[PDB]
Nucleic acid binder design. Sequence first.
DNA 1: AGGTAAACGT
DNA 2: AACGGTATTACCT
Length: 202
Amino acid sequence: EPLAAGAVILRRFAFNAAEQLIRDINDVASQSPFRQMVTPGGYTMSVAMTNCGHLGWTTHRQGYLYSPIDPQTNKPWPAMPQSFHNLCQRAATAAGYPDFQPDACLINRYAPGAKLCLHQDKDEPDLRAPIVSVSLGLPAIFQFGGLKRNDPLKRLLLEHGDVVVWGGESRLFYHGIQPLKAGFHPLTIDCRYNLTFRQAGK
DNA sequence: AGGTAAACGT
DNA sequence: AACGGTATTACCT
Ligand SMILES: O=C(O)CCC(=O)C(=O)O
Ligand SMILES: [Mn+2]
């Protein structure tokens, strides 16, 4: 019944914290605005993104990279809000990863139709640390597979406040998001946000 | 050697 | 529309 070895879903874990989380997303984006990044191959992603914390995930021509500087503003990413950090630590603890210290939070925003094709999170040098993923606003279908792209997928609806954590044996599993269905949510109005916490540095 | 980008047709 | 090809290569370090 558990998501996978080392992996768990904490349904509605972030429900009570969500209004403050969303105020702080708005604050982060007021400094480093959401933008749709362009892949190395030249395609614009459907998800709009920004980052907070000491390191931010970015693409550039040469690949994927963590950087301490937002290439759009040329200034450091905004500091990680304490609300984000406190929620992360509680969720990580509840999921069995009490020692997790993220230094990076990638904020994804899904408009209707936006998706994330199956991928692995492998840009982090220390793969001992888990990923903590917090869903806010409109629901989305999350794909969670195995070590190989063709391993069979579990498909789970992720609703507002749901937190998923993966690590250990499932750290490098393929995962993704199916094209967002249009809808209404009273706190985000017409979108989904996802916060993805990582330990990106050493 | 090995790391690793990947987001159209059936 | 769920599944899988593509990187079965071309380039870095
Ligand atoms: O949006 C999600 O639920 C997953 C996001 C994700 O996998 C990523 O940003 O790497
Ligand atoms: Mn991911």
